[PDB]
Amino acid sequence: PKRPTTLNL
Amino acid sequence: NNFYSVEIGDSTFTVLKRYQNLKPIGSGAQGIVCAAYDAILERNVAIKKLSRPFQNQTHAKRAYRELVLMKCVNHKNIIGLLNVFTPQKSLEEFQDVYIVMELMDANLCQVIQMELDHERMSYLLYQMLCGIKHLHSAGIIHRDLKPSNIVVKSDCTLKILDFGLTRYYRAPEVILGMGYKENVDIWSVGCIMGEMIKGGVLFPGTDHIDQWNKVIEQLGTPCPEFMKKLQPTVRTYVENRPKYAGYSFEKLFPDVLFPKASQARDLLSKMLVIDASKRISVDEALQHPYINVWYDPSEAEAPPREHTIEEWKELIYKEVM
Ligand SMILES: O[C@H]1CC[C@H](Nc2nccc(-n3ncc4ccccc43)n2)CC1
């Protein structure tokens, strides 16, 4: 499973 | 002359010329923090000026504890020290301690209420746990994790801001006056997770007593075996509330709330357990199928009194040096 690399602040 | 001065309100920040663009972003009892751009590392940093480190032995010991634990503790999921310094040139002139950390983009307060998918939810929680596990390995039990002291960057990375000791994320052990162990931190992680899934505070007690009632209204009145562990005064109160059954976690977290949901539920039902002797451990939570997906042994398994003011001063001065 691919580690998320974006997060919406 | 390696240093320059900027006035932040009524306080003067004297910092190395490499540290530019100072903007205050924090001010508690612990100290003023500025955000800043580091022109040597070519990245953004947080610079904290310690509030009166040698005013007294309370301040002195806390500052010592902060300095040493930040030097030795080192993990991608813990705010680490980039640098420390004082603008003063001798032990005698010594006054101020400046700690430099990586600047994170946000705390978890506003993020957790935005519905994340499982991938992000589980990854953020996997990160916290790796941080907590590392703290615990250094003999540091936090006791006070909450959205405000867990920080993130826009790349979905995450670090624990500080080293601990809003009562909504406090473990029942802390709320009452019982002893605690490592898995006291599991509870705080349990509240934070539940919140992510639900969209608001799990147990919003309006006071140190209502916190208890909020907890039992949802989880059920703990066992009489648990009651026997309480101090007489708290036990007379707690023991004489009406009896709550609590709701099953299926009811507390139904498929309806989620974006896997079955796995997240099993975990929650193991973290939000009032009696700590029955609450899941950090290692068992790391091995949980909802968290295990990210497992990396380099991340989840890494390696680890009495003084006067003038002595503390020196001890701190050497640590700066
Ligand atoms: O709301 C967000 C929260 C995170 C901020 N970034 C950040 N990064 C490192 C340390 C730090 N500290 N360290 C101590 C401290 C105290 C108050 C505020 C920030 C603090 N704050 C950016 C703004």
Q: Which residues of B159-168 are buried (b: 16+ CB within 10 A; e: fewer)?
A: bbbbbbeebb
Contact B104, B45 (CB under 8 A): no
H or E stretch at B155: none
The overall longest dimension of chain A from CA atoms, in Å, is 23
Chain B interface, best mutation among A5, A7, A8, A9, by max B CB count within 10 A:
A7
B123 to chain A: which residues are within 8 Å by CB?
3-4
How many other C-beta atoms are found inside a 10 Å radius of the C-beta of residue B79?
23
Does residue B101 have its Cβ closer than 6 Å to ligand 1? yes
Specify the experimental method: X-ray
Strand order in the sheet with B19-27: B19-27, B31-38, B43-50, B98-102, B81-85
Of B105, B152, B293, the CB nearest to A1: B293
Contact B196, B169 (CB under 8 A): no
Q: Which residues of B35-46 are buried (b: 16+ CB within 10 A; e: fewer)?
A: ebbbeeeeeebb
* Separation between Cα atoms, residue B262 and residue B310, nearest integer Å: 58
Across the interface, whether the CB atoms of B154 and A7 are under 8 A apart is answered: yes
Residue at B65: amino acid letter: R
Instruction: DSSP letter for B144, please.
Output: -
What tokens appear for B146 in the block? 């909450």
Q: How far from B103 is each of B80, B182, B220, B236, CA to CA, in Å?
A: 11, 28, 41, 47
Crossing angle for the helix pair B261-271 and B184-198, to the nearest 10 degrees:
140
- Secondary structure E strands in chain B: 3-8, 11-16, 19-27, 31-38, 43-50, 81-85, 98-102, 106-107, 150-152, 158-160
Phi, psi (5° rounding) for residue B106?
-155, 165
Domains present along chain B, CATH in parentheses: 3-105 (3.30.200.20), 106-302 (1.10.510.10)
* Separation between Cα atoms, residue B138 and residue B250, nearest integer Å: 37
Across the interface, whether the CB atoms of B156 and A5 are under 8 A apart is answered: yes
Calculate ∠ Cα B166-B265-B204, nearest 5°: 20
